[PDB]
Design a protein around this motif. Structure first.
Motif, PDB file in Angstrom:
ATOM      1  N   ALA A 174       4.628  -1.136  10.956  1.00 48.06           N
ATOM      2  CA  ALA A 174       5.761  -1.521  10.114  1.00 48.06           C
ATOM      3  C   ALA A 174       5.722  -0.913   8.719  1.00 48.06           C
ATOM      4  O   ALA A 174       6.728  -0.971   8.001  1.00 48.06           O
ATOM      5  CB  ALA A 174       5.855  -3.050  10.024  1.00 48.06           C
ATOM      6  N   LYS A 175       4.597  -0.309   8.328  1.00 48.61           N
ATOM      7  CA  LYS A 175       4.537   0.302   7.005  1.00 48.61           C
ATOM      8  C   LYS A 175       5.649   1.357   6.883  1.00 48.61           C
ATOM      9  O   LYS A 175       6.299   1.476   5.830  1.00 48.61           O
ATOM     10  CB  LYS A 175       3.173   0.949   6.744  1.00 48.61           C
ATOM     11  CG  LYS A 175       3.006   1.374   5.293  1.00 48.61           C
ATOM     12  CD  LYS A 175       1.556   1.762   4.973  1.00 48.61           C
ATOM     13  CE  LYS A 175       1.389   2.102   3.490  1.00 48.61           C
ATOM     14  NZ  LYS A 175       1.946   3.449   3.112  1.00 48.61           N
ATOM     15  N   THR A 176       5.876   2.104   7.963  1.00 48.52           N
ATOM     16  CA  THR A 176       6.927   3.130   7.989  1.00 48.52           C
ATOM     17  C   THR A 176       7.780   3.126   9.245  1.00 48.52           C
ATOM     18  O   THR A 176       8.795   3.833   9.308  1.00 48.52           O
ATOM     19  CB  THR A 176       6.342   4.571   7.921  1.00 48.52           C
ATOM     20  OG1 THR A 176       5.478   4.795   9.048  1.00 48.52           O
ATOM     21  CG2 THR A 176       5.575   4.786   6.645  1.00 48.52           C
ATOM     22  N   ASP A 223      -3.573   0.874   9.083  1.00 46.56           N
ATOM     23  CA  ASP A 223      -2.960   2.180   8.958  1.00 46.56           C
ATOM     24  C   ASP A 223      -1.973   2.451  10.072  1.00 46.56           C
ATOM     25  O   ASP A 223      -2.379   2.734  11.206  1.00 46.56           O
ATOM     26  CB  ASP A 223      -4.055   3.248   8.978  1.00 46.56           C
ATOM     27  CG  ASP A 223      -3.513   4.646   8.734  1.00 46.56           C
ATOM     28  OD1 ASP A 223      -2.275   4.822   8.707  1.00 46.56           O
ATOM     29  OD2 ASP A 223      -4.344   5.568   8.593  1.00 46.56           O
ATOM     30  N   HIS A 224      -0.688   2.363   9.736  1.00 48.48           N
ATOM     31  CA  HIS A 224       0.389   2.631  10.694  1.00 48.48           C
ATOM     32  C   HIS A 224       0.128   3.863  11.553  1.00 48.48           C
ATOM     33  O   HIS A 224       0.325   3.817  12.766  1.00 48.48           O
ATOM     34  CB  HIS A 224       1.736   2.795   9.967  1.00 48.48           C
ATOM     35  CG  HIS A 224       1.723   3.811   8.860  1.00 48.48           C
ATOM     36  ND1 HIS A 224       2.763   4.690   8.654  1.00 48.48           N
ATOM     37  CD2 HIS A 224       0.820   4.069   7.884  1.00 48.48           C
ATOM     38  CE1 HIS A 224       2.503   5.446   7.600  1.00 48.48           C
ATOM     39  NE2 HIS A 224       1.329   5.087   7.112  1.00 48.48           N
ATOM     40  N   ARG A 225      -0.343   4.960  10.960  1.00 42.77           N
ATOM     41  CA  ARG A 225      -0.564   6.159  11.771  1.00 42.77           C
ATOM     42  C   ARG A 225      -1.725   6.109  12.749  1.00 42.77           C
ATOM     43  O   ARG A 225      -1.738   6.845  13.721  1.00 42.77           O
ATOM     44  CB  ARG A 225      -0.675   7.385  10.871  1.00 42.77           C
ATOM     45  CG  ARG A 225       0.590   7.563  10.040  1.00 42.77           C
ATOM     46  CD  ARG A 225       0.805   9.020   9.592  1.00 42.77           C
ATOM     47  NE  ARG A 225       1.869   8.988   8.592  1.00 42.77           N
ATOM     48  CZ  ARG A 225       3.160   8.835   8.863  1.00 42.77           C
ATOM     49  NH1 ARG A 225       3.597   8.799  10.124  1.00 42.77           N
ATOM     50  NH2 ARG A 225       4.026   8.772   7.855  1.00 42.77           N
ATOM     51  N   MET A 226      -2.713   5.248  12.507  1.00 42.53           N
ATOM     52  CA  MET A 226      -3.789   5.157  13.477  1.00 42.53           C
ATOM     53  C   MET A 226      -3.177   4.517  14.736  1.00 42.53           C
ATOM     54  O   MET A 226      -3.459   4.920  15.863  1.00 42.53           O
ATOM     55  CB  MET A 226      -4.934   4.296  12.932  1.00 42.53           C
ATOM     56  CG  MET A 226      -5.762   4.986  11.864  1.00 42.53           C
ATOM     57  SD  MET A 226      -6.675   6.389  12.560  1.00 42.53           S
ATOM     58  CE  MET A 226      -7.818   5.496  13.690  1.00 42.53           C
ATOM     59  N   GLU A 243      -8.080   0.856  -4.151  1.00 47.20           N
ATOM     60  CA  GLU A 243      -9.117   1.831  -3.833  1.00 47.20           C
ATOM     61  C   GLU A 243      -8.535   3.234  -3.703  1.00 47.20           C
ATOM     62  O   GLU A 243      -9.270   4.171  -3.409  1.00 47.20           O
ATOM     63  CB  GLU A 243      -9.796   1.489  -2.501  1.00 47.20           C
ATOM     64  CG  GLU A 243     -10.460   0.147  -2.483  1.00 47.20           C
ATOM     65  CD  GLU A 243     -11.061  -0.162  -1.131  1.00 47.20           C
ATOM     66  OE1 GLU A 243     -11.935  -1.041  -1.092  1.00 47.20           O
ATOM     67  OE2 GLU A 243     -10.665   0.472  -0.117  1.00 47.20           O
ATOM     68  N   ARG A 244      -7.225   3.382  -3.905  1.00 48.09           N
ATOM     69  CA  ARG A 244      -6.571   4.698  -3.811  1.00 48.09           C
ATOM     70  C   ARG A 244      -6.425   5.232  -5.239  1.00 48.09           C
ATOM     71  O   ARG A 244      -5.842   4.593  -6.109  1.00 48.09           O
ATOM     72  CB  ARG A 244      -5.239   4.564  -3.073  1.00 48.09           C
ATOM     73  CG  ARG A 244      -5.467   4.168  -1.596  1.00 48.09           C
ATOM     74  CD  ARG A 244      -4.166   4.155  -0.817  1.00 48.09           C
ATOM     75  NE  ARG A 244      -3.537   5.471  -0.784  1.00 48.09           N
ATOM     76  CZ  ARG A 244      -2.290   5.683  -0.369  1.00 48.09           C
ATOM     77  NH1 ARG A 244      -1.552   4.655   0.030  1.00 48.09           N
ATOM     78  NH2 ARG A 244      -1.784   6.916  -0.365  1.00 48.09           N
ATOM     79  N   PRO A 245      -6.934   6.452  -5.483  1.00 42.37           N
ATOM     80  CA  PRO A 245      -6.922   7.086  -6.804  1.00 42.37           C
ATOM     81  C   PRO A 245      -5.599   7.318  -7.487  1.00 42.37           C
ATOM     82  O   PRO A 245      -4.606   7.624  -6.837  1.00 42.37           O
ATOM     83  CB  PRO A 245      -7.697   8.381  -6.561  1.00 42.37           C
ATOM     84  CG  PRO A 245      -7.260   8.750  -5.190  1.00 42.37           C
ATOM     85  CD  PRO A 245      -7.375   7.416  -4.459  1.00 42.37           C
ATOM     86  N   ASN A 293       0.877  -1.175   0.000  1.00 44.66           N
ATOM     87  CA  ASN A 293       0.000   0.000   0.000  1.00 44.66           C
ATOM     88  C   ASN A 293       0.909   1.218   0.000  1.00 44.66           C
ATOM     89  O   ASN A 293       0.599   2.243   0.621  1.00 44.66           O
ATOM     90  CB  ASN A 293      -0.923   0.005   1.230  1.00 44.66           C
ATOM     91  CG  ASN A 293      -2.088   0.985   1.076  1.00 44.66           C
ATOM     92  OD1 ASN A 293      -2.325   1.511  -0.006  1.00 44.66           O
ATOM     93  ND2 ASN A 293      -2.831   1.213   2.163  1.00 44.66           N
ATOM     94  N   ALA A 294       2.031   1.086  -0.709  1.00 44.22           N
ATOM     95  CA  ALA A 294       3.054   2.139  -0.794  1.00 44.22           C
ATOM     96  C   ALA A 294       2.701   3.150  -1.872  1.00 44.22           C
ATOM     97  O   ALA A 294       3.040   2.960  -3.025  1.00 44.22           O
ATOM     98  CB  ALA A 294       4.418   1.500  -1.098  1.00 44.22           C
ATOM     99  N   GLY A 295       2.035   4.231  -1.484  1.00 45.16           N
ATOM    100  CA  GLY A 295       1.632   5.234  -2.458  1.00 45.16           C
ATOM    101  C   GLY A 295       2.749   5.861  -3.281  1.00 45.16           C
ATOM    102  O   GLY A 295       2.671   5.904  -4.510  1.00 45.16           O
ATOM    103  N   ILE A 296       3.804   6.335  -2.630  1.00 42.80           N
ATOM    104  CA  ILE A 296       4.863   6.973  -3.390  1.00 42.80           C
ATOM    105  C   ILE A 296       5.497   5.977  -4.371  1.00 42.80           C
ATOM    106  O   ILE A 296       5.827   6.345  -5.493  1.00 42.80           O
ATOM    107  CB  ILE A 296       5.906   7.635  -2.430  1.00 42.80           C
ATOM    108  CG1 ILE A 296       6.829   8.554  -3.226  1.00 42.80           C
ATOM    109  CG2 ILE A 296       6.646   6.580  -1.645  1.00 42.80           C
ATOM    110  CD1 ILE A 296       6.072   9.771  -3.857  1.00 42.80           C
TER     111      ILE A 296
HETATM  112  O1  LIG Z   1       2.428   7.838   5.401  1.00 41.17           O
HETATM  113  C1  LIG Z   1       1.223   8.319   5.498  1.00 41.17           C
HETATM  114  O2  LIG Z   1       0.738   8.809   6.484  1.00 41.17           O
HETATM  115  C2  LIG Z   1       0.361   8.295   4.329  1.00 41.17           C
HETATM  116  N1  LIG Z   1       1.040   7.666   3.215  1.00 41.17           N
HETATM  117  C3  LIG Z   1       0.385   7.646   1.937  1.00 41.17           C
HETATM  118  P1  LIG Z   1       1.355   6.850   0.788  1.00 41.17           P
HETATM  119  O3  LIG Z   1       1.044   5.358   0.964  1.00 41.17           O
HETATM  120  O4  LIG Z   1       2.814   7.126   1.072  1.00 41.17           O
HETATM  121  O5  LIG Z   1       0.879   7.426  -0.519  1.00 41.17           O
END
Ligand SMILES: O=C(O)CNCP(=O)(O)O
Ligand SMILES: O=C(O)C1=C[C@@H](OP(=O)(O)O)[C@@H](O)[C@H](O)C1
Length: 427
Positions: free
Chosen positions: A410-412, A384-387, A123-125, A94-97
């Motif tokens: 662990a996502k970040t 969601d790592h941040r939650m 589901e992410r645009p 789920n790595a957006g960048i």
């Molecule tokens: O790290 C965050 O809070 C949100 N990340 C969104 P990404 O998956 O990097 O596009």
């Protein structure tokens, strides 16, 4: 499922040497891969998002070695656009960048590659980026839902006049900016209207310059890029500590310090999230700035009402810090919280109410009125790592809190809880 229960933390105080920046890490890896020469990255982040990028590079044939703790990486630059055929599938979690940047970069030349990821990533645009890449000549096919991954990339981006919508994600522009220099023709990227998360564009331009490329930025409304360029290894490059990961620790001190110092970022950092310290200062905390550190010392904590579009990620930390502030806090202009790891406006509002807060979930803002006293809750984390990290701050009260699926950090930040524990004091 898995869970972690945090006992009440009486005081926080100490120093945290930050894990590497995820934003800088994934940009540096991609640019190092496209560049000529060997790049040595130090303080690289080891987390799910970086691991998916490293795996993608491996799959694309890029050679690199990692140190034992995976924070030092020696990358053998490809000396040009990366290539693969046969509809090679790159799984990007789920790595957006990684998803956005590779979707653009792999449009250079010919290729036949499929980018996909976890269910939430589908589901992410990404339509605004696909629209832009197609105006530049790329052939892109949506394999499932239109405007979302997975994508089948068949190349063809040559440059030219490209419009891109910047109202939902700055990552689309970032992806175009890193890709355009290697296109054969010159490119003029015109932003359609509003541009959100603007500070991340500065991170991108900073990294591009480090790798030898500059472009003409015309007030962030239009960017003029010369094609036919090449990225060049900067030799040894130090990845900044992650300013978003630092937010939890600085906020912890603002709430229950003590003084907490985070190292690896300082007044000269390129990350927009160091501005999170400014918000804590406005709430009543004391902040110290160094060349390689930022520290926060407990003062007082008052509610604030501000536009957080410039620090969307670190802003989540203010939503839980708000539970400890005097008055009602309002965070505005954060619509894209809805299209990230989870719909963060819905998730944050839902979990905050569980510990007792009265919350208005606005379409693009959130208003939080703290309860006189927090109560125990089992917090859902929505992959969601941040939650998980934001709600860990609930334990800086008289009540414990149980965090579901703690490993989602662990996502970040795989070592988040051990690091929070390092500065947690009983006395
Ligand atoms: O790290 C965050 O809070 C949100 N990340 C969104 P990404 O998956 O990097 O596009
Ligand atoms: O470019 C980057 O490194 C990022 C930009 C932001 O996304 P948006 O531009 O979609 O807000 C941020 O939320 C994400 O964690 C990382």
């Amino acid at each position: 499922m898995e869970s972690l229960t945090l006992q009440p933390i009486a005081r926080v105080d100490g120093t945290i040497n930050l894990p590497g920046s995820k934003s800088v890490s994934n940009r540096a890896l991609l640019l190092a891969a496209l560049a000529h020469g060997k790049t040595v990255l130090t303080n690289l982040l080891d987390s799910d998002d970086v691991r998916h990028m490293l795996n993608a590079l491996t799959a694309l044939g890029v050679s690199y070695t990692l140190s034992a703790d995976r924070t030092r990486c020696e990358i053998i630059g490809n000396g040009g656009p990366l290539h693969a055929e046969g509809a090679l599938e790159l799984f990007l979690g789920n790595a957006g960048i990684a998803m956005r940047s590779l979707a653009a970069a792999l449009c250079l030349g010919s290729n036949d590659i499929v980018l996909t990821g976890e269910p939430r990533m589908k589901e992410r645009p990404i339509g605004h980026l696909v629209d832009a890449l197609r105006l530049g000549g790329a052939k892109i096919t949506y394999l499932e839902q239109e405007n979302y991954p997975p994508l089948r990339l068949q190349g063809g981006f040559t440059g030219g006049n490209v419009d891109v919508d910047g109202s939902v994600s700055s990552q689309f522009l970032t992806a175009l900016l890193m890709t355009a220099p290697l296109a054969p023709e010159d490119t003029v990227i015109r932003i359609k209207g509003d541009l959100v998360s603007k500070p991340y564009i500065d991170i991108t331009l900073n990294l591009m310059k480090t790798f030898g490329v500059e472009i003409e930025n015309q007030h962030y409304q239009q960017f003029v890029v010369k094609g036919g360029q090449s990225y060049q290894s900067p030799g040894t490059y130090l990845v900044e500590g992650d300013a978003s990961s630092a937010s939890y620790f600085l906020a912890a001190a603002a709430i229950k310090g003590g003084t907490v110092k985070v190292t690896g970022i300082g007044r000269n950092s390129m990350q927009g999230d160091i501005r999170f310290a400014d918000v804590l200062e406005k709430m009543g905390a004391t902040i110290c700035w160094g060349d390689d550190y930022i520290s926060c010392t407990r003062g007082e904590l008052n509610a604030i009402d501000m536009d957080m579009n410039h620090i969307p990620d670190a802003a989540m930390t203010i939503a839980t810090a708000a539970l400890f502030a005097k008055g009602t806090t309002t965070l505005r202009n954060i619509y894209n919280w809805r299209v990230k790891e989870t719909d963060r406006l819905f998730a944050m509002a839902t979990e905050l109410r569980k510990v007792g807060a009265e919350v208005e979930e606005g379409h693009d803002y959130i208003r939080i009125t703290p309860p006189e006293k927090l109560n125990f809750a089992e917090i859902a984390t929505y992959n969601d790592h941040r939650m998980a990290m934001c709600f860990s701050l609930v334990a800086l009260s008289d009540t414990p809190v149980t965090i579901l699926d703690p490993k989602c950090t662990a996502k970040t930040f795989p070592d988040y809880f051990e690091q929070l524990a390092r500065i947690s004091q009983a006395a």
